[PDB]
Design a protein around this ligand. Structure first.
Ligand SMILES: *[C@@H]1O[C@H](CO)[C@@H](O[C@@H]2O[C@H](CO)[C@@H](O[C@@H]3O[C@H](CO)[C@@H](O)[C@H](O)[C@@H]3O)[C@H](O)[C@H]2NC(C)=O)[C@H](O)[C@H]1NC(C)=O
Ligand SMILES: *[C@@H]1O[C@H](CO)[C@@H](O[C@@H]2O[C@H](CO)[C@@H](O[C@@H]3O[C@H](CO)[C@@H](O)[C@H](O)[C@@H]3O)[C@H](O)[C@H]2NC(C)=O)[C@H](O)[C@H]1NC(C)=O
Ligand SMILES: *[C@@H]1O[C@H](CO)[C@@H](O[C@@H]2O[C@H](CO)[C@@H](O)[C@H](O)[C@H]2NC(C)=O)[C@H](O)[C@H]1NC(C)=O
Ligand SMILES: *[C@@H]1O[C@H](CO)[C@@H](O[C@@H]2O[C@H](CO)[C@@H](O)[C@H](O)[C@H]2NC(C)=O)[C@H](O)[C@H]1NC(C)=O
Ligand SMILES: *[C@@H]1O[C@H](CO)[C@@H](O[C@@H]2O[C@H](CO)[C@@H](O)[C@H](O)[C@H]2NC(C)=O)[C@H](O)[C@H]1NC(C)=O
Ligand code: NAG
Ligand code: NAG
Ligand code: NAG
Length: 374
């Protein structure tokens, strides 16, 4: 039985910044020299015959090898040991995914667990809801190195809208006799959208008569989420309130649009829809007209018989006026038809036609009035 040196514990696993006791002993009856050699710290100490104890506090190093040495009978007697540290995955961070992610396009997922060690004992897993997307074990990494990073790129889908993404960090110390420490990051909700480059189809009449209700409709296709989409449809600068329903992935905006006049002779119909960070618009110009139908009025209601009269129309100097088939003569006016009253002319209808062209389209309206002859 020769002389020996013994320190306890031989190998010790202690949390980073923690503390532990080392008492180094020997069988030498009267050692001339003894002490503990390490790089870390001292808090308090307990010694005596054949053994000394040191309190190593605040351990900031991944791996250290404390050596306790003794001297008896002018010989060097030493003992070596091992102290390693770990760090819980207390801080786990997930990157701030884009506000709106296009459906059918890839996006990055990166879980970040800084400071956690040892790296080889870290198992990182990306989670969508309760489902595991990917599992990456870092086993085979240097024991000295800490921290872990897991990056994976997945495909944005339809269901991915309103779905939670997180990352689970597992530090497995179990084979070392300590245990398993796992902590999950903050779940992040994703919002996905798909907006077709196609322009919305707008159904509108070319001409709009004042005081008449002409229905208009603005629709599109392939919009998700459909309910999330906001739609504006109006007449010129005058706001409207379209009834909006949802047929499939398509929205249907339908309402009746009246005319005022107001202003002026022509305008545009504006329909635009903002979904997420993108928006589409279709503008169909529409000419607006007012039709002042000519008057059938007479110079005088009676006029017996034999006295001439002057008949007027007044389409408003726009349309070409024809009163009972006469191309008046002269234009820009309710131009006159001069007729001497006759008994045979009793109750004769005057046909007044007004031909007005707007935006290249011709419109006419007709009626008749009579005159009594005494
Ligand atoms: C989603 O992201 C992944 C990863 O960035 C990409 O998918 C990859 O797209 C490329 C382009 O077609 C391909 O990668 C490689 O293609 C060559 C042939 O050109 C082949 O020899 C390689 O083995 C590899 O497949 C491939 O389609 C695909 N690769 C994988 C592993 O998925 C792309 O950015 C996105 N995928 C889409 C949009 O489908
Ligand atoms: C996915 O994760 C998100 C958070 O990133 C979860 O949202 C959270 O849960 C619900 C919304 O579904 C909210 O519930 C709250 O309940 C309490 C008690 O009833 C009430 O006082 C609150 O006013 C609210 O209604 C909660 O606020 C919300 N948290 C945040 C920050 O928005 C979502 O639930 C997860 N998905 C699933 C399927 O669980
Ligand atoms: C470090 O080791 C020494 C080895 O001597 C321990 O001292 C012994 O303590 C036991 C207690 O069960 C006694 O029975 C022995 O008689 C002690 N040895 C001697 C030589 O007196 C010491 O206690 C250990 N340190 C700690 C903190 O336990
Ligand atoms: C390090 O020294 C501190 C004193 O600065 C020791 O603290 C004593 O013991 C416990 C543990 O912190 C405290 O609750 C007591 O109040 C402290 N005693 C006194 C008299 O102050 C501590 O034990 C030492 N060791 C470690 C590992 O911290
Ligand atoms: C949705 O419609 C509204 C109508 O009020 C648009 O508002 C104007 O649109 C023009 C052309 O896009 C802009 O130049 C003006 O600055 C807007 N002014 C106001 C007060 O909104 C709106 O722009 C349309 N949305 C999109 C994305 O075009
Ligand atoms: C889990 O990680 C979060 C990340 O911020 C941290 O705030 C929390 O203290 C951790 N919990 C435990 C028990 O480690
Ligand atoms: C509609 O009118 C606008 C002017 O307001 C004009 O720029 C545009 O070309 C017109 N549309 C067509 C198809 O001509
Ligand atoms: C006027 O005559 C045209 C052509 O005969 C006809 O289409 C139209 O209905 C008539 N107007 C009225 C109010 O009946």
């Amino acid at each position: 039985e020769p002389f020996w040196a013994d320190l306890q514990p031989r190998v010790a696993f202690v949390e980073r910044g923690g503390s532990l006791w080392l008492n180094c002993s020997t069988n030498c009856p009267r050692p001339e020299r003894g002490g503990l050699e390490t790089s870390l710290r001292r808090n308090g100490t307990q010694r005596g015959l054949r053994w000394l104890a040191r309190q190593l506090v605040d351990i900031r190093e991944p791996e250290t090898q404390p050596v306790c040495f003794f001297r008896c009978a002018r010989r060097t007697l030493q003992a070596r040991g091992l102290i390693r540290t770990f760090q819980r995955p207390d801080r786990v961070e997930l990157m701030p995914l884009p506000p709106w992610q296009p459906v059918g396009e890839n996006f990055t997922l990166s879980c970040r667990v800084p400071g956690a060690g040892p790296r080889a004992s870290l198992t990182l897993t990306l989670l969508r809801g309760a489902q595991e997307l990917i599992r990456r074990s870092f086993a085979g990494e240097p024991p000295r190195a800490r921290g872990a990073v897991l990056t994976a790129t997945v495909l944005a889908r339809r269901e991915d809208h309103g779905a939670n993404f997180s990352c689970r960090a597992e530090l497995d110390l179990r084979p070392h006799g300590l245990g398993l420490f796992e902590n999950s990051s903050a779940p992040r909700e994703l919002r996905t959208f798909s907006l077709s480059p196609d322009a919305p189809r707008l159904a509108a009449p070319r001409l709009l008569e004042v005081g008449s209700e002409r229905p208009v409709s603005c629709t599109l296709d392939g919009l998700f989420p459909a309910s999330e989409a906001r739609v504006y449809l109006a007449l010129g600068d005058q706001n409207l309130s379209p009834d909006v329903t949802l047929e499939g992935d398509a929205f249907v905006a339908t309402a009746t649009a009246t005319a005022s006049a107001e202003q002026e002779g022509a305008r545009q119909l504006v329909c635009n829809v903002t979904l997420g960070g993108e928006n589409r618009e279709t503008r169909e110009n529409v000419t607006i007209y007012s039709f002042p139908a000519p008057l059938l009025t007479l110079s005088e209601p009676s006029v017996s018989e034999g006295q001439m009269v002057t008949v007027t129309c007044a389409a408003g100097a726009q349309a070409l006026v024809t009163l009972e088939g006469v191309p008046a003569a002269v234009p820009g006016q309710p131009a006159q038809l001069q007729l001497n009253a006759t008994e045979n002319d009793d109750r004769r209808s005057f046909f007044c036609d007004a031909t007005l062209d707007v935006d290249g389209e011709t419109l006419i309206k007709n009626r008749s009035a009579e005159l009594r002859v005494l």
